[PDB]
Amino acid sequence: MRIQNRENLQLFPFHLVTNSPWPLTTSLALMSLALTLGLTMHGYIGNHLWLFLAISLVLSSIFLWVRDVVIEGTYLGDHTIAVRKGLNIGFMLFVLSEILIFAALFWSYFHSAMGPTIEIGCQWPPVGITSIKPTELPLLNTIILLASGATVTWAHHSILYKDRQGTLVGLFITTLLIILFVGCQVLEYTWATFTIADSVFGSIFYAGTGLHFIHMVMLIVMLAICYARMYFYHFTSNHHLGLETTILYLHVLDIIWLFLYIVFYWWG
Amino acid sequence: SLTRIQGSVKRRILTDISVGLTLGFGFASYWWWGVHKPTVAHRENYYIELAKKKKA
């Protein structure tokens, strides 16, 4: 603190965010989504062009937050060593919360599997409910996810050795390699012979493999925003907190899939 | 002598824990020998008189 002109710069390494309008807008978008969804399922709206508008507004609100979180790290220059560590801790504390919604779903599958009721004849996947062969497309998906886990590690080891063509290719292959997972798991819901309402089995199967779907569309969006933010020279060889955040989300999703394949497709 | 006083609060603590427990045991030994046991006795003497009528 005895540097010559030290009062001209901030005396602590923490970010004083300027006033922004996004928290209010997201709240008003969620209000409209909640009320419109709670009404449209019971009459009172009729037209489904309001629910779609509400969802679009929510997504646009998150996108417009993230713009201002990118102009403050690449252009203004406010992410010191401390702010980056805080961001990492925060992201881990959200991944942990997203893992504990899957534990509830797994405990809803072991509370029905072990102890099947009298109404259904005591047997898993019960009579008249033909399961999905787990030596078909649901192995191709597992091989794809394991490959995607290895293609992003070639993207993070090429941004440290300073290869640009070799960090763009890895991200491109990874993004083309999670779209095939979505395509395979959308060709496996249109080739199935049991719906949401035919049992307690088809209602938990499509609630742990349907939330994973929503979580894998987000990977495609994150990886696109990480390819486009590398094409435009936004990432340095030692300051890239979007790749690290996207890689710790891919790996959690792969580990969760390895527990929806040996507990949902194989076990029974 | 009278000009060497060393520990006074410790004795107070010992006397105030040895009287908050005597009161507690006194106010808890009335719940078990003046409110509970006579009730059980009354209950039992009711049943050793409802059976003698049936025997007769």
Binding site: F110, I262, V263, W266, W267, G268 | -
Partner: protein, 374 residues
């Protein structure tokens, strides 16, 4: 009542194997600051196995004459004495004597108690459920024990973890006071297939047996780990067990039990090898998870295999599988810690783990023989 007897035996086994693991976070460190050896600590953790294995033959003779209840109460008395000795013991002889007494106490609360449950429930169907429920907290003991010992050792002194167990044992003993010829094991350890089945469990659990004494010392030296952390590193394995035995218990019926055991051996071997390459406590989360999961698979696959092999190749009794598993576990726990000092003083800690991992991996291919047994 039958339910109260089940409660008594369940709590007895839980307290017996809970006191076998609260020692682990504590004694390796307690006998490491008094000096300011490897074989010494390795044998401190191995008196229990030898004593139990040598007392199993004679506790049966004891239970033939006097009966069931008195031997059960003897396990009470011995285990209470052992917990009091562990409460106040800074000399290696006293702790060694405590572990030696623990073996007799444990063997008296298992041979007699399981027989008591068998005697009470004579249905041949309810026996399976009762014996399974009673033996389930046997594994919970080493899930609730390691963290508790480390936490109360860091936060409080040594005697705090060791007097709670004494109080709980005394409650169990008060409840006990209130409540009150098949094919021999020798021949069943003669036919080769059950020999392979028992060896599977022995070599599977030798890894954890060797990790128990040795791991805290290496962690303290190369890691600068705190007193509590020694417990936490062992949390992922135990929890992992409770996962692996729920999924791969039914899955092995359709994947082939032999294949399940063979894969579990490879997984545990790789997990054991990966342990030496850890620099932070987060690095122990993965290999411990793997070792617990693989041991769970190996147990859940091999043990019913022993039941089927025994009831096909020979004529069987109810405690036959239990006796086989007792001899296997005790032999493994005797051998592991005992060879730990010898194979860790001359050569470093990584080498002993590597040897055990290679042994498990090379024993894996023998599981093919159990497929389609004669």
């Amino acid at each position: 009542s039958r339910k109260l007897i089940l409660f008594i035996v369940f709590l007895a086994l839980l307290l017996d194997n809970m006191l076998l693991t609260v020692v682990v976070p504590i004694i390796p460190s307690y006998l490491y600051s008094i000096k300011h050896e490897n074989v010494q600590v390795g044998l401190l953790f191995a008196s229990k196995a030898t004593v139990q294995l040598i007392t199993n033959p004679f506790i049966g003779l004891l239970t033939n004459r006097i009966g069931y209840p008195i031997p059960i109460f003897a396990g009470f008395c011995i285990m209470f004495v052992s917990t009091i000795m562990f409460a106040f013991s800074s000399s290696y002889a006293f702790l060694l004597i405590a572990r030696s007494l623990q073996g007799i106490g444990s063997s008296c609360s298992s041979v007699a108690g399981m027989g008591m449950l068998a005697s009470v429930y004579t249905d041949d169907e309810e026996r399976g459920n009762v014996m399974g429920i009673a033996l389930g907290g046997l594994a919970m003991g080493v899930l609730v024990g390691p963290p508790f010992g480390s936490v109360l050792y860091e936060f409080v002194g040594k005697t705090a973890p060791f007097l709670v167990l004494a109080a709980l044992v005394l409650l169990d003993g008060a409840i006990q006071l209130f409540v009150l010829k098949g094919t021999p094991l020798t021949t069943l350890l003669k036919d080769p297939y059950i020999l392979i089945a028992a060896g599977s469990i022995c070599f599977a659990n030798m890894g954890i047996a060797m990790l128990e004494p040795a791991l805290p010392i290496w962690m303290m030296e190369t890691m600068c780990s705190r007193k509590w952390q020694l417990g936490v590193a062992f949390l992922p394995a135990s929890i992992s067990y409770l996962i692996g035995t729920n999924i791969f218990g039914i899955l092995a019926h359709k994947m082939g039990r032999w294949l399940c055991a063979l894969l579990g051996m490879i997984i545990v071997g790789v997990s054991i090898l990966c342990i030496p390459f850890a620099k932070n406590i987060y690095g122990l989360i993965a290999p411990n998870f793997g070792v617990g999961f693989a041991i769970g698979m190996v147990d859940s696959s091999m043990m019913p295999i022993m039941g089927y092999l025994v009831d096909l190749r020979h004529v069987s009794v109810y405690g036959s599988v239990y006796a086989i598993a007792d001899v296997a576990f005790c032999m493994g726990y005797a051998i592991g810690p005992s060879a730990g000092g010898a194979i860790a003083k001359a050569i470093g800690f990584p080498w002993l783990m590597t040897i055990i991992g290679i042994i498990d991996i090379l024993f894996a291919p023998l599981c093919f023989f159990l497929r389609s047994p004669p």
